């Protein structure tokens, strides 16, 4: 894998709110 | 007011104008269990 990204460093995951319609 | 009140530090107030039309909603969390690194290979 070509990483080319910051090595995580305390990953801030995202809360996703799901809307049902 | 509510936010200036000290009790508001127990809540995360966020605006949601499009809420009266919600039928429905769910949120998800992805907590995982940390592991200690036992040194020997098993």
């Amino acid at each position: 894998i070509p990483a080319g990204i910051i090595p995580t460093g305390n990953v801030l995951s995202t809360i996703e709110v799901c809307i049902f319609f | 007011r509510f936010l200036e009140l000290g009790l508001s530090v127990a809540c995360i107030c966020t605006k949601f104008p499009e809420l009266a039309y919600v039928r429905d909603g769910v949120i998800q969390f992805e907590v995982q269990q940390p592991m200690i690194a036992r040194d020997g290979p098993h």
Partner: protein
Amino acid sequence: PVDQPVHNYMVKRIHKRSLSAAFAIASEALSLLSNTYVAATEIDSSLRIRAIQQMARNLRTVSDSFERGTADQLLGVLLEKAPPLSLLSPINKFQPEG
């Protein structure tokens, strides 16, 4: 004329430890890896970045596990490297010369 300097030369054994951890990979991750390793006009960028992000998350978790366990091992060895107070202090006080 009875005094003379005296020297002491202590030498230590270095002991030996190691590290090991488990980290599994799915075949689909490797397959999407293969196209991303040759990243070109093809190979869905969104799926590639999703897979690499997930794999990097898991890899960094298992990597930080090592530093997490280093403290465990060190505290264990110091715990194994200590006598009780109630057995050391009395000799430490009640022995003027030996």
